[PDB]
Amino acid sequence: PMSTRIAEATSAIVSKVGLPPTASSGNMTLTSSEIQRHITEFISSWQNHPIVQVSADVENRKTAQLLHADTPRLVTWDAGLCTSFKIVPIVPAQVPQDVLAYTFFTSSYAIQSPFPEAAVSRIVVHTRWASNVDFDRDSSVIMAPPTENNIHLFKQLLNTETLSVRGANPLMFRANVLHMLLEFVLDNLYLNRHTGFSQDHTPFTEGANLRSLPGPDAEKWYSIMYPTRMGTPNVSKICNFVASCVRNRVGRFDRAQMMNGAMSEWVDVFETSDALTVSIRGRWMARLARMNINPTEIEWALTECAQGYVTVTSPYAPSVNRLMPYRISNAERQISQIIRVMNIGNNATVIQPVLQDISVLLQRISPLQIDPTIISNTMSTVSESTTQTLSPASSILGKLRPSNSDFSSFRVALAGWLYNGVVTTVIDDSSYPKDGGSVTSLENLWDFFILALALPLTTDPCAPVKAFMTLANMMVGFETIPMDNQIYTQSRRASAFSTPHTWPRCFMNIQLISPIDAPILRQWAEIIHRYWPNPSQIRYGTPNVFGSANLFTPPEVLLLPIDHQPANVTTPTLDFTNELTNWRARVCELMKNLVDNQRYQPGWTQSLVSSMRGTLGKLKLIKSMTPMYLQQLAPVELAVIAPMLPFPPFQVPYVRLDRDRVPTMVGVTRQSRDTITQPALSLSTTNTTVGVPLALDARAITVALLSGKYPPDLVTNVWYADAIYPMYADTEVFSNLQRDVITCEAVQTLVTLVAQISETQYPVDRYLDWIPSLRASAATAATFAEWVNTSMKTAFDLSDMLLEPLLSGDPRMTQLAIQYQQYNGRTFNVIPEMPGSVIADCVQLTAEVFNHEYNLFGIARGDIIIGRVQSTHLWSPLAPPPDLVFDRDTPGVHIFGRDCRISFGMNGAAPMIRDETGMMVPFEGNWIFPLALWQMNTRYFNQQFDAWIKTGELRIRIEMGAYPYMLHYYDPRQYANAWNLTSAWLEEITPTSIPSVPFMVPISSDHDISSAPAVQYIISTEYNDRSLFCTNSSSPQTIAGPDKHIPVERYNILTNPDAPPTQIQLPEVVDLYNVVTRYAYETPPITAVVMGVP
Amino acid sequence: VLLQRISPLQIDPTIISNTMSTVLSPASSILGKLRPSNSDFS
């Protein structure tokens, strides 16, 4: 096809290293090879262009992220009831039973119940099971009922080698649980929404205002939301619990009606909820409310940013309580700037598109335009004789045409002022003469003019020495100066003097250059010393709202290589009082004095000297407005553009010829070394240099300086007010700030979570130490960090990359700091302070609550005991009697774990296993085993212990610390044996996985029953029946089996009239019913409130 | 061969390429010299 044909042709036409050369590697017609050689020369000349060498048509994977970063979704609304724990019925209740009537139950009357009536009902975890959000976070935590297994939620992160459907490695339980809690917190990040109310017409409540959930089938939620609304006709447990509550806490009880005929700003409602998620959403709301701004401050920020050229208006009336979360702090801005600088290091192909975009913006906003016809006219009006064999006017006109005809090397040069910390715009090699030079040659003389007039625009800290070295390179043999050493002689290429250490002493101490032997070089040195441009500042930006992400410099301040003198008039016109015109005039005068030298004038003819003098005079008296623009209009445009920009200015101080404050290196850090534990000491040796050199063409810059004029009839304020308005309306400045906030929160939560499984230097409080964990290493930390990053991206829905620059290294011990060092060894550093992080705080809070309510998540703290217990009693295995539990502090108990040997018993002797104390004991008694001991010797232990556990007198307490459990409910009236399950578990134990522990639990029944023998083997040690909610709720009593009424300790604000409504005893128990605030704020776009007055 | 089979250390040259996030420059000459594509580390 045509695409590949074009590609092949282009490759064939176009396509045809640093190492020293080695000896190993008249009548001209027209010929194919003769054409080919010209084609090769042409294509090589094109390829050796500095702009072409770095130009690209499509952006790479990181320039797009740097320029157009995906905006995250901060504000989201939940319209349903906020909770995470639901009540599920495990076993159905016997509604038709012998000793009762079927009319006793309320279930026979189709009466709605806030709690599911059943023989046994437990409580599980289900994030957003009654929620009606608009944007759905893919993160979620779903727990199956404990009768069904849940092992698939604990084998996600690092269980890639289990080779079992129901197995999981115990050592990664902490790593999986931390990720589970992180997913819980990330899912429960929503703002409660006010939806609507309706006063009930029924006498159940005292005319309270109920709340209506959206959706078509909302009939069901009116019973779940208000437990104390149903009738109480029965002595059942549900009605007994309901009748003991307080009647006057249902629905709305506090509103804020700021405006008539408008939605209430916020309301407070009594409804079924979850204390943990209510607290989490309250913290999230507080974090967002700390970030709010109003239209008045938005107007002030926009006006100060625009410098008053374009106006802004804001309304003056009562508000509607809108959300503008855009304001952020300064530490977050500095951290984001550090990360942005870090991800761009020594590339030179990622920062160039930013410079191109800024140059395009400058070209679109600026009133100056480049017009090279002024030079053509002023050189056509030159007086010279025809008989001469070379003409300075034609020579300079031919030389002053840029290669590849591009003039984009001047706006980019201006845009490079904003970034001198990372980009050092230098003059390309091809601009310098091919081999030194010679003042006897007019073409080289013009090249020197171009180079000397174009050098001051660059940001290279070595242009002052490079210009002098260019002139010295030209004037060799004709005129000599003392150099430093034998390597950097007077003949060394001027482009090779880019290091401050290479500055010759004759350039500093001009007394070395003898005036009677090198007057021209002496004069050039004095001119460079006295007339180089002076730096200044512009004071851009608005720190009130946008912050100030400008480090190494005081806030709201931008530096400029050339000085700024503002203009007191709005109708400018040509004048020559400024550094650029002075520089041009002094260069022309120096050339004239060089021509008038008594050692040089006799070499030239009479007419050519006059022609050169006239050309120099016209060049010095040319009418160019570029110096005036650069002096007094360019800083204004730069300060206008700088604030709203996808990459804020990153600058280092400028120094004029003083090579004692020249910044040699600048570097960032991400990690710390060894035991240093202190950035102020780490940063000196744990940093990587950041920066690139960029090449430009001097001819284009010289043309731009020499030729540029304003429109014939312009007024500056009107022109800028026309050109600036469209830009200000776009307002993408606001979006970035949000991404910076989430980036800072992400890095802080990353370090906080890594501190849980690894050893770090930050002070971190840990709660999950009782859950077993492995010896974490760099690979484990990296994998955990990658999982955290993936979760925190799939939440907030970001397709770009975040925390990759920090995770490229070792994520165990991280830090953010920066450093730049002067030539004289002085070092300045910036170590931003770590701000707060609501996400990390909520994760820590969730871990704290999990420490007390692990049973809610299916984890059972403790360890199991294996031993035959044959009895007809009805106690539950998760609440065993104390007389069966033994531990290390019990007399007559053998403890194993260090080393194990089995001595087979011959001639009827009994086999013995060596206790770690040294003694050996038979296969009977009370033992203690670490889990790893059985895991490492599964097959050997099962063969020699099951035959004694099942029937003998062997009891083993396997120490775990944490384990998931699975429940089996049997019928007390009939026989039941658990040996099959208790042996399947032991068989399926593997050196790298253990299946869920099975627990055989009876079923409670109100009517008395006849019991049957029950044999069970595995029991727990400490209490684990916390997920149990109620037994025989529909029935009014429970006689046989484990029982408990509805937990009073949960519904505190109903069973305790004295307690205030807004109390949470959260770190121990969960209220499951508490007051929750419903907001009705609205979030409009900026331009819908803040206008611009075109 | 036996030591390679036993040793838990596995070698992937992608670490160097990821660390030197490039898109002659010194950051590219070194990456072209260490040749992070050959998997023969005998």
A650, with CB counted inside 10 A (0-12, 13-18, 19+), is buried
A742, with CB counted inside 10 A (0-12, 13-18, 19+), is buried
Residue A574 DSSP class: -
Q: What is the DSSP string of B1-42?
A: -HHHHH-S----THHHHHHS-----HHHHHHHHH-TT-----
Tokens 């408008």: give the residue: A262
- Cα-flanking dihedrals φ and ψ of residue A109, to 5°? -105, 10
Between CA B23 and CA B15 the distance in angstroms is 16
**How many residues are there in chain B?**
42
B25 with A348: Cβ contact below 8 A: yes
For residue A402, give every residue at least 6 positions away whose Cβ sits within 8 Å of its Cβ, in sequence order, or none. A409, A697, A699, A700, A703
Tokens of A691: 């920066």
8 Å CB contact between A250 and A270? yes
A720 to chain B nearest CA, in Å? Answer: 39
- Cα-flanking dihedrals φ and ψ of residue A869, to 5°? -130, 95
Helices (H), A509-605: 519-531, 579-595
Q: Which helix (H) or strand (E) holds A695?
A: strand A692-696
Between CA A746 and CA A758 the distance in angstroms is 18
Residue A262 DSSP class: S
Strand, coil or helix: A286:
helix
Between CA A780 and CA A802 the distance in angstroms is 19
Residue A859 DSSP class: E
Tokens 């000349």: give the residue: A45
Between CA A184 and CA A60 the distance in angstroms is 35
Beta strand A663-671 with A688-689 is antiparallel
Tokens of A1019: 């029991």
Nearest to A529 by CA among A618, A446, A468, A598: A468
8 Å CB contact between A977 and A896? no
Please report, for chain A, how many H helices and E strands are present, in that order: 33, 28
For residue A783, give every residue at least 6 positions away whose Cβ sits within 8 Å of its Cβ, in sequence order, or none. A157, A158
Helices (H), A435-535: 442-454, 463-474, 505-508, 519-531
Between CA A957 and CA A1018 the distance in angstroms is 10
Between CA A4 and CA A2 the distance in angstroms is 6
Closest chain A residue by Cα to residue B16:
A808
Side chain identity, residue B15 = I
Closest chain A residue by Cα to residue B10:
A779
A297, with CB counted inside 10 A (0-12, 13-18, 19+), is middle
Side chain identity, residue A476 = V
* Interfacial residues of B (vs A; Cβ cutoff 8 Å): 18-19, 21-27, 29
8 Å CB contact between A532 and A456? yes
Widest distance between CA atoms in chain B: 41
A347 with B23: Cβ contact below 8 A: yes
Between CA A956 and CA A950 the distance in angstroms is 12
B25 with A350: Cβ contact below 8 A: no
Tokens of A739: 């991404």
A610, with CB counted inside 10 A (0-12, 13-18, 19+), is middle
- Which of B18, B24, B29 is opposite residue A808, by nearest beta carbon? B18
Beta bridge partners of A369: A709
Which chain B residues are within 8 Å of A18, Cβ to Cβ?
24, 29
Residue A412 DSSP class: H
Strand, coil or helix: A288:
helix
8 Å CB contact between A854 and A1068? no
From residue A323, how far is each of A164, A261, A319, A441, A1089 by CA, in Å?
Answer: 50, 20, 11, 71, 12
Helices (H), A188-229: 221-224
Between CA A20 and CA A277 the distance in angstroms is 70
Task: State the resolution, in angstroms.
Answer: 3.4
Residue A245 DSSP class: S
Q: What is the DSSP string of A77-94?
A: EE-S---SEEEEEEE---
Widest distance between CA atoms in chain A: 136
For residue A34, give every residue at least 6 positions away whose Cβ sits within 8 Å of its Cβ, in sequence order, or none. A28
In a mutational test of the B interface, the residue from A54, A808, A810 whose CB has the highest number of chain B CBs within 10 Å is A808
Between CA A46 and CA A25 the distance in angstroms is 25
8 Å CB contact between A378 and A622? yes
Q: How many CB atoms lie within 10 A of CB A615?
A: 24
Side chain identity, residue A238 = I
Closest chain A residue by Cα to residue B9:
A779
Between CA A595 and CA A582 the distance in angstroms is 20
- Cα-flanking dihedrals φ and ψ of residue A678, to 5°? -170, 100
Tokens of A310: 């374009």
A346 to chain B nearest CA, in Å? Answer: 8
8 Å CB contact between A97 and A1007? yes
Tokens 């005068």: give the residue: A589
Tokens of A979: 């040996």
B23 with A346: Cβ contact below 8 A: no
Q: What is the DSSP string of A90-146?
A: EE---SS-SSS-TTSSGGGGT---SS---SEEEEEEBTTSS---SS--S---B---T
Q: What torsion do the CA atoms of A122, A126, A127, A128 make, to the nearest 10 degrees?
A: -100
8 Å CB contact between A820 and A652? yes
**How many residues are there in chain A?**
1094
8 Å CB contact between A150 and A1065? no
Q: Give the count of Cβ contacts less than 8 A between chain A and B.
A: 22
Nearest to A403 by CA among A703, A37, A11: A703
A349 with B23: Cβ contact below 8 A: yes
Side chain identity, residue A714 = L
- After which residues are there C–N gaps above 2.5 Å in chain A? 16, 25
For residue A145, give every residue at least 6 positions away whose Cβ sits within 8 Å of its Cβ, in sequence order, or none. A88, A90, A122, A124
Give CA A893 to chain center in angstroms: 55
Tokens of A315: 């309304």
Q: Which helix (H) or strand (E) holds A960?
A: strand A954-969
- After which residues are there C–N gaps above 2.5 Å in chain B? 23
B33 to chain A nearest CA, in Å? Answer: 13
Between CA A537 and CA A549 the distance in angstroms is 17
Cβ-count burial A987-1023 (b if 16+ within 10 Å, e if not): eebbeebbbbbbbbbbbbbbeebeeeebbbbbbbbee
8 Å CB contact between A651 and A796? no
Closest chain A residue by Cα to residue B17:
A808
Tokens of A350: 């990622």
Beta bridge partners of A266: A1079
Helices (H), A925-1066: 931-936, 938-949, 979-988, 1052-1055
Between CA A457 and CA A451 the distance in angstroms is 11
Q: How many CB atoms lie within 10 A of CB A738?
A: 20
Between CA A427 and CA A432 the distance in angstroms is 9
- Which of B19, B23, B27 is opposite residue A60, by nearest beta carbon? B23
Nearest to A532 by CA among A378, A387, A658: A658
Nearest to A453 by CA among A475, A431, A474, A480: A431
Which chain A residues are within 8 Å of B24, Cβ to Cβ?
17-18
For residue A28, give every residue at least 6 positions away whose Cβ sits within 8 Å of its Cβ, in sequence order, or none. A34
Residue A601 DSSP class: G
Side chain identity, residue A801 = M
From residue A959, how far is each of A23, A860, A919, A948, A985 by CA, in Å?
Answer: 77, 12, 21, 20, 16
For residue A664, give every residue at least 6 positions away whose Cβ sits within 8 Å of its Cβ, in sequence order, or none. A500, A821, A822, A823
Q: What torsion do the CA atoms of A468, A474, A480, A486 make, to the nearest 10 degrees?
A: 80
8 Å CB contact between A480 and A504? no
Beta bridge partners of A1019: A865
8 Å CB contact between B12 and A779? no
Strands (E) in A421-568, as ranges, are: 423-427, 536-537, 559-560
Q: Which helix (H) or strand (E) holds A1079?
A: strand A1073-1079
Nearest to A1022 by CA among A861, A875, A865, A849: A861
Q: Which helix (H) or strand (E) holds A618?
A: helix A606-620
Question: Structure solved using which method?
Answer: cryo-EM
Between CA A715 and CA A717 the distance in angstroms is 6
8 Å CB contact between A1024 and A879? yes
Between CA A36 and CA A50 the distance in angstroms is 24
**Half-sphere exposure of residue A68, counting CA atoms within 13 Å on the CB side?**
7
Q: What is the DSSP string of A903-924?
A: E---TTPPPEEE-TTS-EE-S-
Residue A903 DSSP class: E
**Half-sphere exposure of residue A368, counting CA atoms within 13 Å on the CB side?**
26
Between CA A415 and CA A88 the distance in angstroms is 65
Closest chain B residue by Cα to residue A810:
B19
Rg of chain B over CA atoms, in angstroms? 13
Beta strand A120-125 with A1028-1031 is antiparallel
A169, with CB counted inside 10 A (0-12, 13-18, 19+), is buried
**Half-sphere exposure of residue A902, counting CA atoms within 13 Å on the CB side?**
11
Tokens 């910390």: give the residue: A421
Q: How many CB atoms lie within 10 A of CB B41?
A: 7
Tokens of A880: 């065993």
Q: Which helix (H) or strand (E) holds A869?
A: strand A859-871
A27, with CB counted inside 10 A (0-12, 13-18, 19+), is exposed
For residue A231, give every residue at least 6 positions away whose Cβ sits within 8 Å of its Cβ, in sequence order, or none. A111, A204, A239
Q: How many CB atoms lie within 10 A of CB A789?
A: 19
Between CA A1019 and CA A1002 the distance in angstroms is 13
B25 with A346: Cβ contact below 8 A: yes
Between CA A656 and CA A741 the distance in angstroms is 38
- Cα-flanking dihedrals φ and ψ of residue A993, to 5°? -165, 150
Residue A517 DSSP class: T
Nearest to A1039 by CA among A1009, A1069, A1014: A1009
Tokens of A817: 């700091």
Between CA A277 and CA A81 the distance in angstroms is 11
Tokens of A33: 């090879």
